Design a binder for this molecule. Structure first.
Ligand SMILES: OC[C@H]1O[C@H](O[C@@H]2[C@@H](O)[C@@H](O[C@@H]3[C@@H](O)[C@@H](O[C@@H]4[C@@H](O)[C@@H](O)O[C@H](CO)[C@H]4O)O[C@H](CO)[C@H]3O)O[C@H](CO)[C@H]2O)[C@H](O)[C@@H](O)[C@@H]1O
Ligand SMILES: OC[C@H]1O[C@H](O[C@@H]2[C@@H](O)[C@@H](O[C@@H]3[C@@H](O)[C@@H](O)O[C@H](CO)[C@H]3O)O[C@H](CO)[C@H]2O)[C@H](O)[C@@H](O)[C@@H]1O
Ligand SMILES: [Ca+2]
Length: 559
């Protein structure tokens, strides 16, 4: 296991270890398709009473997350069985899935929630969470089965299984003011602020409304739940796109929020509001073991430094999972799991405080990225991305490495290495933008490899990509491209110990002409022990057509 170490186990419904009398979808890479949008690009379709998928626990479990697709505008159930005995019902719904666009307007992915004439549905999968009153042992047969009264049809994509500890009590009621049936989050924080013996607030097991942005000020604040399966912060679900969560004022730098879940009411992307945590320039804040869904982002840092995001679960958001921008340095984004983000799952955007520096994105998992990349780094200096797992990108690379400025004021990459070290990227890449007049055309889109190295309008230099396994990328393993006419010379771009397995087109693509008016790459890159295995067409494309780009084959290359 590369990536996050999480207490839950993921099993694909379509796994060959699972008996089923339903319909296993043949894989594809199509957005807007129940196979293309599934984890592992396949799911099991249950379509008649009595159809099931039978999972086998490989670890003890009392709790489950079922990723699934149901019809638009429906809510209902699907049944769970343990060793042949019915044990309850998942609450399944398309309330948060189904976002509408057209193949030529994928720029709108995530923004537009209503069906319409000529619109195609995307973002088809969503999740149902269920805890059972018993810990079932490894080897237990857990059956997801469509019974009478359950939904008319359901695509079963994957199952999380987890052995959840009992909820933790208030660590000390004389130091943590408890949220109660009669005392709100806001009221407990007021009592906390006015009593200097309090370290913070404790939010018990339950469902607690967050209908506002809850401001943390006065001093560093501890916000402690009972555990993410127990303490549920819930945005009013009869409202939609309510900007709720926490806002950490500078006075509350050094705060900690942990051991709770937060359930937003966003049903489409909104730019501006919608981050669960607002923390304008916050420092030394710790966000740990929380589980957030249906917000625009978990957090969007702006000159936020020395913070720690650890052990979190970020699922089904409408834009980025975590992004750190405009000077955000020396942060610890460690051991977080992301599935179903609406833009770059984990991103670092360096702008203006010359650069984002000294950040460490470690032990990160980012799957089912419904737009943009699993991991993305835009400029910066001395930033480490280490032990990553990315898989199943709908429209973009597993890893984007870009010195494009997006019109903002940035210097690009700095004089110290941006390092990608230890990464597994399964079925990443996709289609986006347009390729009018493009060389190497296969469709109406630009086509993206597992890792995109993009020289934009700013310096593209000091990039180290090592110890990377790239499995069945949609199109390419590595994709190098320079934006014209800037033609920034790539320097100190090095690739070491990389395996690219069964790319449909090429192991490595030097983009010659992305679209009309665009040219080949400038500079070069070195390759050491880079193996390309079974490319659909050839190992490398574009070398003879890129006369300003020098491929250096140091050693160990089978191409
Ligand atoms: O899913 C990607 C991205 O989309 C949204 O953010 C948009 C943001 O990217 C930008 O749009 C583009 C730039 O990305 C850039 O794209 C050019 C493109 O025009 C194309 O010809 O080819 C190259 C690649 O070979 C692209 O880099 O530049 C153009 C024009 O300069 C921009 O329009 O700005 C738009 C709004 O103007 C954003 O919508 C999305 O929000 C974001 O989350 C996502 O990562
Ligand atoms: O309107 C809110 C702020 O706008 C400016 O800040 C931008 C950030 O909020 C952020 O916005 C992202 C947006 O560009 C797009 O990519 O969608 C993301 C997801 O919803 C947004 O978070 O990032 C931008 C790029 O760094 C910022 O320009 C103003 O500078 C700020 O004062 C406003 O409060
Ligand atoms: Ca699956």
């Amino acid at each position: 296991g590369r990536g996050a170490n999480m207490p839950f186990t993921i099993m694909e419904a379509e796994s060959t270890s699972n008996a089923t009398n339903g319909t296993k979808l043949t894989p594809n890479f199509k957005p807007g398709d129940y196979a293309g949008e599934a984890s592992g690009r396949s799911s099991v379709y249950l379509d008649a009473t009595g159809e099931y998928v039978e999972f086998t626990l490989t670890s003890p479990a009392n709790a489950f997350v079922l990723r699934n697709a149901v019809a638009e505008n429906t809510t209902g159930t699907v049944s769970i069985y343990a060793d042949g005995v019915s044990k309850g019902k998942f609450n399944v719904s398309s309330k948060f899935s189904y976002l509408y666009a057209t193949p030529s307007t994928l720029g709108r992915l995530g923004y537009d929630n209503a069906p319409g004439a000529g619109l195609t549905a995307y973002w088809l999968y969503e999740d149902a969470q269920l805890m059972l009153d018993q810990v079932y042992p490894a080897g237990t047969k857990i059956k997801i089965q469509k019974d009478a009264g359950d939904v008319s049809w359901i695509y079963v994509d994957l199952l999380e299984t987890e052995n959840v500890a009992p909820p933790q009590a208030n660590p000390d009621p004389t130091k943590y003011v408890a949220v109660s049936a009669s005392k709100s989050i806001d009221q407990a924080l007021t009592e906390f602020r006015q009593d200097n013996t309090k370290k913070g607030i404790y939010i018990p097991a339950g469902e607690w409304t967050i209908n506002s942005k809850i401001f943390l000020y006065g001093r560093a604040t501890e916000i402690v739940g009972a555990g993410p399966w127990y303490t549920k912060l819930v945005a009013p679900q009869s409202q939609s796109n309510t900007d709720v969560g926490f806002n950490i004022s500078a006075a509350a730098n050094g705060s900690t929020i942990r051991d709770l879940s937060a359930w937003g009411n966003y049903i489409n992307r909104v730019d501006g509001p919608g981050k669960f945590i607002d923390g304008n320039g916050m420092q030394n804040v710790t966000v740990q073991n929380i589980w957030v869904e249906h917000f625009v982002c978990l957090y969007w840092g702006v000159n936020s430094s020395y913070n720690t995001f650890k052990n979190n679960r970020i699922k089904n958001t409408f834009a980025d999972g975590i992004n750190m921008t405009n000077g955000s340095s020396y942060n610890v984004i460690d051991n977080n799991y992301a599935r179903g983000t609406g833009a770059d799952s984990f991103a670092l955007f360096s702008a203006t405080g010359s650069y984002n520096v000294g950040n460490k994105y470690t032990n990160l998992t980012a799957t089912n990225v419904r737009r943009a990349a699993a991991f993305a780094v835009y400029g910066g200096s001395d930033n480490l991305f280490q032990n990553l797992y990315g898989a199943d990108t709908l429209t973009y690379p597993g890893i984007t490495i870009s010195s494009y400025s997006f019109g903002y004021n940035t210097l690009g990459f700095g004089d110290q290495d941006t390092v990608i070290d230890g990464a597994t990227l399964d079925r990443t890449g996709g289609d986006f933008w347009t390729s009018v007049g493009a060389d190497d055309k296969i469709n109406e889109y630009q086509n993206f490899g597992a890792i995109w190295i993009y020289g934009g309008d700013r310096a593209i230099k000091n990039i180290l990509i090592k110890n990377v396994d790239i499995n069945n990328p949609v199109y390419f393993g590595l994709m190098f491209q320079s934006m014209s006419p800037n033609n920034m010379v790539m320097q100190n771009i090095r690739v070491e110990n990389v395996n690219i397995n069964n790319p449909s087109r090429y192991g490595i693509k030097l983009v010659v002409r992305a679209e009309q008016g665009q040219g080949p790459a400038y500079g070069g890159a070195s390759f050491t022990n880079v193996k390309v295995n079974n490319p659909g067409i050839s190992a490398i494309y574009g070398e003879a057509q890129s006369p300003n780009f020098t491929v250096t084959r140091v050693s160990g290359n089978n191409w």
